[PDB]
C-alpha cells in the first residue's frame, strides 16, 4: 500500500466528476484534489451524447414551464425542491461552458440556438452539432488542465472507499498499468463513476459502464434508490444497440412495419402527419414509452421484420435527400452504413428499442451528500431525484454540469471540517481491501466469468424491460440469485500483473451482479406502474399515487440479501395530477 493525502478525492472523470474537480479547484485554490478514473478522462461515456443539454434560454420560455415539464415528465416522482434548483441553474452552467469555449452550434446572429427535445412545448436544448456530449467532455477536460490543483490518477481502477465512525476517510485503487495499489486518503469523496446500463444484454452504453460506484456504495450500507426505473431508447441499431438519435426522427424520420404502414397512428398517436410536417407529441415524435410500447404491440402482432440481428421496425429517412441531412444529420449517416450496411438514401435502417439510462442511483440529499457524512455522489451513478420515474431527454448532461459543481463545492467544504478519524481503524480497513481482493485472485473453481456476464445481461433484458410481469421478474431474481452464487466459483486466468483486464473485468461483473439484484427486487415490489416501469399483471397496471408515491430504497445487506425501504416524495407547488 503506497498512500497519498489529498484534500478531496473524485472517483471518475466524464462530465460530472470532471466538473466537480474544477469546482473544488476554485472554491479553494490551495486544495490538493485527486481525480481518479480507470480510463483517460476523455474516453468517458459522456462523449457519446448527441442531443444536448437542456437549459432555459428562450425569451418565451420560463423556469415554471421547465419545472412543470420535468415533474410531470417523471410522473411526480421527482423531489421538487431538488428540481426547482436544477431548473434554475442550468443556464448559468451552460453559459459557463460556452465561456470555457465549448463550441455550441449558433444562430446567424452569433447567439446560442436551441432544439426540440424530450417532449417539451417550449424548446430549450442547447447543442454543439450532433456531437454535444463530446464537445462537453472534451471541453471540461482541457479546461481542468489549467489548474494544477487537480492531480489526475488516470487508469486507476478504484476498489473500495474507506469508512469509519459514520465518515469517509479515503479510498483504495489499483494503478492498472503498474499492477499495484495506492490508497488515497481524503475526507470527502465525490462518487461520479457514472452509469449502470451495461448490466443489460442490449443497450447504448459503452464498455466502462458497469455500476462500480453504485456497488461500493451498497457495501457500506448506503442505499440505491429508484433503482427499478430503467429507461429505454426507441431507436437502437440491432445487435450493438447503438444509438440512432431522436434528432433524426425530429428532422423528418419515419417508423414503419413489414407493410411500412406508418404504425404509431393507432396507439393513441394519431392523427397521421405529412412527410414534411413532423409535429411534437404526435405519431413519430410521439411520447417516449409509447413509441417503445408500440414496438412490442407491433412486435406481438407478427408485424416487426426479422433479421439475424433480431426483430425490428424501420425508421425511414430516405425521403429527406441529402442537404437536409448533412447539415444537421451527418454522423448518423456514417453510423448506418458502418454498423449495419445502410446508406441513409437507398434502404431503411433497422432499429429496435434498446436500453439506455439509469434513473436510479445512490441516495443523496439536495447537496449530493449520502447518509455517510463526507460521501457524495453525482451524475448518472447518483439519485438526487431530478428524474423521479423517467428522465427527460436533454436533462441528463444538464445534470452533470449543474450538480457536479454543487457537489464540487459541498464536498470541498465538508472536507474542511471533518476532524480526524481514527487513523488506526481506517488503515486496517484499507488493510482489508487488500486481503479481500486477494481472496478473489486465488479463487480455484472455473467458471468463465464471460458466461455469467452473457447470462445476467440476458436475464435482465427478458424479465426487467419495457413491459413487466410478475412471473417473469421472479425469474430474473431467481436467475441473478444463481449467478450470484456461481460467481463465488469463477477462477481468473491471468495471474499477470500489468494491465490485467481479465481481473478488472471480473471485479466489475461482480458489481453489476449487485446492481441487478437490486433493480429486480425494486421492481417486483412496485405493484403499480410509473413512467418507465409498466406491469400487466391484473391490479397493477395503473399509476397509483395512493400507495405508490414513494422512492424505493434498496440495501444490500452484510448477509448478502437485498432489502427494501420506502421514503416519501417531497412536494412543493405541483400536487399529483
Amino acid at each position: 500500500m503506497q498512500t497519498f493525502q489529498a484534500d478531496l478525492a473524485i472517483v471518475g472523470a466524464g462530465g460530472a466528476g470532471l466538473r466537480a474537480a474544477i469546482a473544488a479547484a476554485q472554491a479553494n485554490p490551495n486544495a490538493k484534489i485527486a481525480l481518479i478514473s480507470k480510463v483517460y478522462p476523455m474516453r468517458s461515456h459522456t462523449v457519446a451524447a448527441q442531443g444536448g443539454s437542456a437549459a432555459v434560454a428562450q425569451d418565451h420560455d420560463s423556469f415554471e414551464y421547465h419545472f412543470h415539464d420535468t415533474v410531470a415528465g417523471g410522473d411526480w416522482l421527482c423531489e421538487q425542491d431538488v428540481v426547482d434548483y436544477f431548473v434554475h441553474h442550468c443556464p448559468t452552467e451552460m453559459t459557463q461552458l460556452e465561456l470555457w469555449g465549448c463550441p455550441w452550434s449558433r444562430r446567424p446572429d452569433g447567439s446560442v440556438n436551441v432544439r426540440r427535445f424530450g417532449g417539451m412545448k417550449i424548446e430549450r436544448t442547447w447543442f454543439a452539432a450532433d456531437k454535444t456530449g463530446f464537445h462537453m467532455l472534451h471541453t471540461l477536460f482541457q479546461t481542468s488542465l489549467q489548474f494544477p490543483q487537480i492531480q489526475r490518477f488516470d487508469e486507476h481502477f478504484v476498489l473500495d472507499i474507506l469508512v469509519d465512525d459514520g465518515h469517509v476517510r479515503g479510498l483504495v485503487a489499483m494503478n492498472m498499468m503498474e499492477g499495484t495499489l495506492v490508497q488515497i486518503r481524503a475526507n470527502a469523496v465525490v462518487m461520479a463513476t457514472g452509469g449502470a446500463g451495461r448490466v443489460y444484454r442490449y443497450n447504448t452504453n459503452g464498455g466502462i459502464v458497469t455500476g462500480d460506484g453504485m456497488g461500493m456504495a451498497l457495501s457500506h450500507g448506503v442505499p440505491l434508490r429508484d433503482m427499478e426505473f430503467v429507461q429505454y431508447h426507441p431507436t437502437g441499431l440491432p445487435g450493438s444497440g447503438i444509438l440512432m438519435t431522436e434528432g433524426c426522427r425530429g428532422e423528418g424520420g419515419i417508423l414503419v412495419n413489414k407493410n411500412g404502414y406508418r404504425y404509431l397512428q393507432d396507439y393513441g398517436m394519431g392523427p397521421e402527419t405529412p412527410l414534411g410536417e413532423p409535429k411534437n407529441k404526435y405519431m413519430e415524435l410521439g411520447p417516449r414509452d409509447k413509441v417503445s410500447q408500440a414496438f412490442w404491440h407491433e412486435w406481438r402482432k407478427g408485424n416487426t421484420i426479422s433479421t439475424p440481428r433480431g426483430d425490428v421496425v424501420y425508421l425511414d429517412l430516405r425521403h429527406l435527400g441529402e442537404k437536409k441531412l448533412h447539415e444537421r444529420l451527418p454522423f448518423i449517416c456514417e453510423l448506418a452504413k458502418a454498423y449495419v450496411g445502410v446508406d441513409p438514401v437507398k434502404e431503411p435502417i433497422p432499429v429496435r428499442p434498446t436500453a439506455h439510462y439509469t434513473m436510479g442511483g445512490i441516495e443523496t440529499d439536495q447537496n449530493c451528500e449520502t447518509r455517510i457524512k463526507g460521501l457524495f455522489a453525482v451524475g448518472e451513478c447518483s439519485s438526487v431525484g431530478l428524474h423521479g420515474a423517467n428522465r427527460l431527454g436533454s436533462n441528463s448532461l444538464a445534470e452533470l454540469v449543474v450538480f457536479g459543481r454543487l457537489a464540487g463545492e459541498q464536498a470541498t467544504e465538508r472536507a474542511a471540517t471533518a476532524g480526524n478519524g481514527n487513523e488506526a481503524a481506517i488503515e486496517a480497513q484499507a488493510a482489508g481491501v487488500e486481503q479481500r481482493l486477494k481472496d478473489l485472485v486465488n479463487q480455484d473453481g472455473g467458471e468463465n466469468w464471460a458466461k455469467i456476464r452473457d447470462e445476467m445481461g440476458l436475464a435482465m433484458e427478458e424479465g426487467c424491460g419495457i413491459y413487466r410481469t410478475p412471473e417473469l421478474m421472479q425469474k430474473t431474481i431467481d436467475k441473478l440469485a444463481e449467478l450470484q452464487e456461481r460467481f463465488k466459483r469463477v477462477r481468473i486466468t491471468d495471474t499477470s500483473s500489468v494491465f490485467n483486464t481479465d481481473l478488472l473485468y471480473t471485479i466489475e461483473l461482480g458489481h453489476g451482479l449487485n446492481v441487478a439484484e437490486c433493480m429486480a427486487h425494486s421492481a417486483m415490489a412496485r405493484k403499480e406502474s410509473r413512467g418507465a416501469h409498466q406491469r400487466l399483471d391484473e391490479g397493477c397496471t395503473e399509476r397509483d399515487d395512493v400507495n405508490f408515491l414513494k422512492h424505493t430504497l434498496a440495501f444490500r445487506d452484510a448477509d448478502g440479501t437485498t432489502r427494501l425501504e420506502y421514503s416519501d416524495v417531497k412536494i412543493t407547488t405541483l400536487p399529483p395530477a
Binding site: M177, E178, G179, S497, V498
Partner: protein, 130 residues
Amino acid sequence: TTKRKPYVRPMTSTWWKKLPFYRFYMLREGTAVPAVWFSIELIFGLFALKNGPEAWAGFVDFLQNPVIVIINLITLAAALLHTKTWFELAPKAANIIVKDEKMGPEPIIKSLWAVTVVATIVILFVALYW
C-alpha cells in the same frame, strides 16, 4: 522494480519502402534532384553563352547527346510531377470562408493550373514566334 518491460520498435531506413503511400511520398521528394541539375545545366548555359559562340555551340552539342536527352525528359517528368503534387498542397494552407462554409481545395487547384496553362503559352510564343 516494475514488472513492466516497455518494448520499443526499430524504425529502419527501409521505412518508406514499406507503404505505397510513403513510396510515393519519397518520390515527390526525389523530384528535387533533377530540379537542381537542370538549374546546373542552365548555369553552364549561362557561362557558355558568354565564353563566346564557339562554346555555346558545344553546350548545344552536349544537349544533342542522346544520354543527356533521356535524362532531360526525365527532368521534365519530375517537374510535371512536382507541379501536379505541389498544386494540390498549397491550397491546404489557406483557410478561406465563402457563403458561410469554409472552402475547399477544388477551386484553387483550378487556377494554379490555369495560370500554368497560360504562362506555358505566353512563354512559348515569346521564345518561338515573335
